[PDB]
Amino acid sequence: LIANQFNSAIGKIQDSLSSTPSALGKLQDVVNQNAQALNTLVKQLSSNFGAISSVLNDILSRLDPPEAEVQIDRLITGRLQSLQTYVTQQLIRAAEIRASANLAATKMSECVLGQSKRVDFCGKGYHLMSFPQSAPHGVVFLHVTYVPAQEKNFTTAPAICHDGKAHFPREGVFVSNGTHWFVTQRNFYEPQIITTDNTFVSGNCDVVIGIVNNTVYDPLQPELDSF
């Protein structure tokens, strides 16, 4: 069953990534940003900045070396300012990408090579494992996780007073369907007969609120009585 659900999950991953073209947007725009920034840099070439013309040669081919240096000064001032703005922009986004890379490496060390108890650090649900995949300038994780479904209603109590003694579950919870009492683990319905072996005794039953009367099963008693 787990195998078939896993296969179905992988197939829907393939189909969902093949169908929706809008999933990879985080990988797209950054690339676009670079080109856009680069583009406007070359678009700053033909700005006159209040000087006579945007060609260096035409200023040189028409004006005098006692005169033209004012125009050249204007040109280099404007272009230099644009270039310094560019390096500021790129270096800030570089810091941003460094932040993302550190986050990705931490997810590499915790989701893949181990099994993290931190909720939603390895995707939604109870984490089981993950696999990495390479991507253009980036990484794509697949988190394989566990979720519950088909819950029901059950009636509970904190502890059970059998013989003047309080009984607490070793691991799990006491439940009742209305007629009998069972003990089960906290994430999957699996009732068991309430024994000594899955419980423990601590104190009497005159302090705990909400404690009910029931029997506990002695494993030793049918062995001792039949002998």
Binding site: A104, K107, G123, V144, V147, F154, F188, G210
Partner: protein
Amino acid sequence: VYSTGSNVFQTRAGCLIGAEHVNNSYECDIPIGAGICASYQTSQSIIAYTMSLGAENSVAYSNNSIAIPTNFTISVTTEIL
């Protein structure tokens, strides 16, 4: 850029023209602001609406009621960095 005297809508963001206010509450499609989002739907025109934040639900609390699942599902999701 040119006016219409038909159907204005004065929200906290400002004055909206070209849309119909809707009494219902839907999910946010594109953000205008102050809780107000817009979409093209039905005849069909562009509408602006108060967001519906989620499906309302109230779990039945008690002091003697426990909910325990019986079945499970393996599910795989993707995440891109």
